[PDB]
Design an enzyme around this catalytic site. Sequence first.
Site, PDB file in Angstrom:
ATOM      1  N   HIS B 232       0.785  -1.133  -0.165  1.00 60.32           N
ATOM      2  CA  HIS B 232      -0.055  -0.124  -0.026  1.00 60.32           C
ATOM      3  C   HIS B 232       0.969   1.097  -0.177  1.00 60.32           C
ATOM      4  CE1 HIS B 232      -3.254   2.858   0.859  1.00 60.32           C
ATOM      5  NE2 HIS B 232      -3.984   1.940   0.920  1.00 60.32           N
ATOM      6  N   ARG B 275      -3.386   1.089  -4.148  1.00 61.36           N
ATOM      7  CA  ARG B 275      -3.042  -0.323  -4.429  1.00 61.36           C
ATOM      8  C   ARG B 275      -3.362  -0.784  -5.682  1.00 61.36           C
ATOM      9  NH1 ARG B 275      -7.069  -3.291   0.171  1.00 61.36           N
ATOM     10  NH2 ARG B 275      -8.071  -1.160   0.785  1.00 61.36           N
ATOM     11  N   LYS B 278      -7.264  -0.702  -7.343  1.00 60.43           N
ATOM     12  CA  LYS B 278      -8.292   0.377  -6.691  1.00 60.43           C
ATOM     13  C   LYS B 278      -8.411   1.585  -7.302  1.00 60.43           C
ATOM     14  CE  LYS B 278     -10.144  -0.506  -3.060  1.00 60.43           C
ATOM     15  NZ  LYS B 278     -10.821  -0.450  -1.580  1.00 60.43           N
ATOM     16  N   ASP B 281      -7.030   8.624  -6.093  1.00 60.54           N
ATOM     17  CA  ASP B 281      -7.303   9.272  -4.999  1.00 60.54           C
ATOM     18  C   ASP B 281      -6.098  10.499  -4.883  1.00 60.54           C
ATOM     19  OD1 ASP B 281      -7.456  10.586  -2.143  1.00 60.54           O
ATOM     20  OD2 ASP B 281      -7.869   8.618  -1.299  1.00 60.54           O
ATOM     21  N   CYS B 283      -4.883  12.143  -2.241  1.00 61.79           N
ATOM     22  CA  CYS B 283      -4.071  12.248  -1.334  1.00 61.79           C
ATOM     23  C   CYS B 283      -2.693  11.361  -1.612  1.00 61.79           C
ATOM     24  CB  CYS B 283      -4.656  11.565  -0.047  1.00 61.79           C
ATOM     25  SG  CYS B 283      -5.075  10.111   0.212  1.00 61.79           S
ATOM     26  N   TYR B 284      -2.904  10.405  -2.589  1.00 68.96           N
ATOM     27  CA  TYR B 284      -1.838   9.562  -3.126  1.00 68.96           C
ATOM     28  C   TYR B 284      -0.437  10.387  -3.969  1.00 68.96           C
ATOM     29  CZ  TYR B 284      -4.637   5.836  -0.917  1.00 68.96           C
ATOM     30  OH  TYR B 284      -5.265   5.035  -0.266  1.00 68.96           O
ATOM     31  N   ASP B 336     -10.262  14.273  -2.564  1.00 71.19           N
ATOM     32  CA  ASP B 336     -10.092  12.846  -2.975  1.00 71.19           C
ATOM     33  C   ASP B 336     -10.403  12.955  -4.477  1.00 71.19           C
ATOM     34  OD1 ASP B 336     -10.494  10.353  -3.859  1.00 71.19           O
ATOM     35  OD2 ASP B 336     -11.619   9.634  -2.180  1.00 71.19           O
ATOM     36  N   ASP B 343     -11.637  18.613   2.569  1.00 78.11           N
ATOM     37  CA  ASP B 343     -11.416  18.524   3.882  1.00 78.11           C
ATOM     38  C   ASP B 343      -9.879  18.845   4.335  1.00 78.11           C
ATOM     39  OD1 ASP B 343      -9.436  16.296   3.533  1.00 78.11           O
ATOM     40  OD2 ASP B 343     -11.371  15.228   3.108  1.00 78.11           O
ATOM     41  N   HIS B 346      -7.073  16.252   2.676  1.00 76.20           N
ATOM     42  CA  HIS B 346      -6.881  16.288   1.140  1.00 76.20           C
ATOM     43  C   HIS B 346      -5.964  17.567   0.817  1.00 76.20           C
ATOM     44  CE1 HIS B 346      -8.986  12.836   1.293  1.00 76.20           C
ATOM     45  NE2 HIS B 346      -8.321  12.224   0.429  1.00 76.20           N
TER      46      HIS B 346
END
Lengths: 323, 407
Positions: B232, B275, B278, B281, B283-284, B336, B343, B346
């Site tokens: 991850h 990962r 999936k 997003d 934040c990655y 996201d 939020d 993020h």
Amino acid sequence: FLSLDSPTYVLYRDRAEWADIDPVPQNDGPSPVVQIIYSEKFRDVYDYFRAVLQRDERSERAFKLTRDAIELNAANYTVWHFRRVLLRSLQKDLQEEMNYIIAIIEEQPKNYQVWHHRRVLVEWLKDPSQELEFIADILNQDAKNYHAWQHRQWVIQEFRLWDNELQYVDQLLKEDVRNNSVWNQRHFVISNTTGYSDRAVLEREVQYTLEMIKLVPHNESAWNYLKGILQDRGLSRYPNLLNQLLDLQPSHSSPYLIAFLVDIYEDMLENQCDNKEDILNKALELCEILAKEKDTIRKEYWRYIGRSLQSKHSRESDIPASV
Amino acid sequence: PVWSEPLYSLRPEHARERLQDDSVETVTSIEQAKVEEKIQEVFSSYKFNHLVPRLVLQREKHFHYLKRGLRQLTDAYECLDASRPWLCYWILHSLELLDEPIPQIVATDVCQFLELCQSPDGGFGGGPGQYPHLAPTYAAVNALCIIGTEEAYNVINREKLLQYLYSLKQPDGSFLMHVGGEVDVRSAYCAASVASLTNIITPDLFEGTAEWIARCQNWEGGIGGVPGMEAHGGYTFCGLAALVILKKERSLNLKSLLQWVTSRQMRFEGGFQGRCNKLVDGCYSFWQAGLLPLLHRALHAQGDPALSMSHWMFHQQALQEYILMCCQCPAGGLLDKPGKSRDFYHTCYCLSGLSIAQHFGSGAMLHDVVMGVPENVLQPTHPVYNIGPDKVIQATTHFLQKPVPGF
Ligand SMILES: Cn1cnc(S(=O)(=O)N(CCN(Cc2cncn2C)c2ccc(C#N)cc2)CC2CCN(C(=O)OC(C)(C)C)CC2)c1
Ligand SMILES: CC(C)=CCC/C(C)=C/CC/C(C)=C/COP(=O)(O)OP(=O)(O)O
Ligand SMILES: [Zn+2]
């Protein structure tokens, strides 16, 4: 007793049986930062939690209060710690507490604290008999829940419950052969039982993978599994592999098949193969096709591989500067 | 040329990057297709409205959002009542990236609040009177270093902090997150981060830690939470970053790792997934892409000659495009993915990732890539700590003035 969402719920400052306790307000200082405007219900529960924590009151009534504090914010590890103190110190029935935690996890399955609590309970009771079935239920609603798979691995390992897992893995691969968590569980089971040195087992695993790749050529999980189980001994150790992949180029191609080809050539050039140069240029060609056309999102990566292979495998790579 | 589209996501070839499900449908492909359709509308909206695209980072809107949050939040944040140093850190770092200075009275108020969060026996808790925990401990330290004054530095009780770390250390090399709590790779990173910054690393503090982390690397190339688990982005960042701090990157197979992360960039969306198989997003953009500067530095120390001298090994252009077009909320704050709400988490990590993608550097070499208007350019971030490179240097130097507790 009195659920946090019951229509007849009453604030703690209005409950007779709590009349003896002075609530303890949060100490945020004279000029707060990141100050949260709590609702009434919330501030009232936590003002009373601080009071019992502060006095280290180990009573039935404090125990019931932690249930509400958790439900308002299940991420509050301090409350969880106090609750575990009261479980031991009041001698609470731990099966009743398992009933409790199984419900909390059902509604908030992506929280760290709730899974850790369940583990401690299983440890205390030394009883894993409810676990695989409970976890299967959670995975039936989100088949990729990280905490769930982690708990499943812990249980199986600590209590040696290996005998039915492969069968379970096969079931979930049926439902969704793209589920990377399940391919990971497969490797986890085989690694810890037979291992991958058993030729019969490795053989079985590769046929199955190649079979799934044929059914779904663009599913990356299968491709990564095949690479994963062959790359430690070394790809070039398996000489039939290359031709069998080329024989899928026609009607089963993908940037994944191309990339694997490059990996095979890469290993070949490391274990000093025949036709040194013929193999190099085949690879540089593919690296280029990927960077320019088939997989441009990774252009910086594929150009790096191309440079690497040149830097160390070209006919001039060992030739002194004076020649 | 006039017919040429300067935005990578809008070029006509781009349509070839849509999902091929081989006519076999499963839950995974259905869900991936929904996102791609939603992202395609965002990309196509300029063409359908007949306007020329303009990628603008909404600095003003984000500033108002942050400036307010730093003081007060709605009850929507009740679920973060045990994570308040994280809120301090997320917000202060966002402001830092946007180059907004911190009023010195704000700085003092943050210091005083974090003091209330500090445990008598070492470490920080999620709020005043809560038990200590390594995650809010990591956030507290980072926030004080962003502030970077003598007042800030002096908040941290170094003797106690080291005592705390020792009480969490396990015989197998790992750390608990907190007393009576869980072990995973995040905790090694949290510990290595605060210990190195504050200069409290004893000869034996991290015995066995590098080895334990290396056991978390799996058949995929990436790193899992504990040995055996799926790889991850969040754990992989933590694992590598901890190794870099300890100077043990070499314990890992850096090559299979590099192949894994680069595969985590989505060919259509341009952003990163956490990962395999999936969803993308925002934040990655930090946890995943943040790995490339780390690998670059590591491979370069091994003498790797094939390394680029101007770019990270991921598509910088396409990541910037995803963040600017898909991850901004008009009212301020980031998110996201389209359809999700804003939020502070993020906001912090989308901007952190944008900075990574704008700024390349390897010792002497320096090269920027700024998509959209030039005012989009952000302040740079340190790939190990995710605070300002200057704030790192300033802090380490200051604490090197003190002796490691116990001499
Ligand atoms: C997909 N994902 C990415 N990171 C995580 S996490 O690591 O699980 N957690 C983020 C949880 N998370 C959810 C999320 C984030 N991206 C997509 N999702 C659905 C958050 C967390 C904070 C905010 C805010 N503001 C918004 C969302 C980050 C925090 C949660 C717990 N944490 C913590 O220190 O808090 C406790 C000590 C109280 C547990 C540190 C890490 C999940
Ligand atoms: C220092 C520190 C605390 C770092 C944070 C590390 C980090 C981001 C960990 C991720 C943990 C996790 C359970 C992700 C999966 O959530 P998900 O299944 O909802 O997300 P996904 O589908 O994208 O995997
Ligand atoms: Zn996210």
